[PDB]
Design a protein around this ligand. Sequence first.
Ligand SMILES: Cc1cc2nc3c(=O)[nH]c(=O)nc-3n(C[C@H](O)[C@H](O)[C@H](O)COP(=O)(O)O)c2cc1C
Ligand SMILES: Cc1cc2nc3c(=O)[nH]c(=O)nc-3n(C[C@H](O)[C@H](O)[C@H](O)COP(=O)(O)O)c2cc1C
Lengths: 157, 156
Amino acid sequence: DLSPTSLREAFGHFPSGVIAIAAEVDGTRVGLAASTFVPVSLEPPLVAFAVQNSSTTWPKLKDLPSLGISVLGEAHDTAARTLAAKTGDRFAGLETESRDSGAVFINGTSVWLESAIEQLVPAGDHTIVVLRVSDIVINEAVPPIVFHRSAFRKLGA
Amino acid sequence: DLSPTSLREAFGHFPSGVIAIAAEVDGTRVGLAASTFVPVSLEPPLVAFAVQNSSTTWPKLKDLPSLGISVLGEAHDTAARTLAAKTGDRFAGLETESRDSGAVFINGTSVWLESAIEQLVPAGDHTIVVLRVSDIVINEAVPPIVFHRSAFRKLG
Ligand SMILES: Cc1cc2nc3c(=O)[nH]c(=O)nc-3n(C[C@H](O)[C@H](O)[C@H](O)COP(=O)(O)O)c2cc1C
Ligand SMILES: Cc1cc2nc3c(=O)[nH]c(=O)nc-3n(C[C@H](O)[C@H](O)[C@H](O)COP(=O)(O)O)c2cc1C
């Protein structure tokens, strides 16, 4: 069928990394997890992800000047679920860095990308958010987590 | 450093699966490998990927009625490379099925997703292609290939 649960299950067979998208307002960290990160363009540098239109967190991020994207590492399985929590501290047991731009990054992750919204494209029950990348940090020693079939896996062979 | 080479390096640290996007035109299969597949919407059912604007294959696919997407499995490292090859038979070595709609699928993959173009969103040197899913089949729980840092990896 093309029902939401059946679609969700089928989509889950396609593996992908997971990001934290986060920023700080008045010293308070605001963020969410997304499995829909896409590296889009090199010139100019663009990325994208898809946000649920019903999100109550996204309205608190979308007007901020800069957002931090962190590609979660293979030990951040609990962190990924925690960043998705409806209630509770989404940054529990995490170490983070807040840049002067307000972008927030998670320490110990594979990649940090500082980003700014370029376009918002309505897409069914989500919105595709296209962002410009303004800064990059790579941590070569941290392999990434992979979200697949509802679970969090590490790369092997 | 925000040069193309620096971005390629950084972007390569993001792991993702690889899909075959394929169709048959006048008896000849046409396709490419993409690692930028993302699920977009459940209601209505939408997915997307990012296509290079300079692609010479995409113009052969973009006006077709229906495209086949197959998620590549861990045995398909060779298949992914071949489906990306700038010359030669991109389907060499593969078992495929072609539907009456023209959509083409790879046998031995976990999921077959049939779809048609919904929107084309310019995005720098790529275009984000939003597709409306018309049919989806889970064939079996075949473990996927993962593209990461220019290598084809399996899940541990
Ligand atoms: C592994 C995983 C991947 C997720 N991917 C997305 C996503 O790509 N887009 C999205 O809007 N929410 C995604 N979520 C949901 C959020 O992270 C979070 O649960 C949601 O934003 C919370 O509701 P709120 O924004 O109304 O506070 C994901 C959650 C998990 C656990
Ligand atoms: C693992 C892998 C992932 C790829 N992902 C994409 C992609 O997401 N988008 C894209 O336009 N090309 C992608 N390519 C490139 C194509 O598969 C192919 O090499 C290209 O379309 C060939 O050039 P042509 O379209 O001018 O024939 C990928 C190639 C490989 C090996």
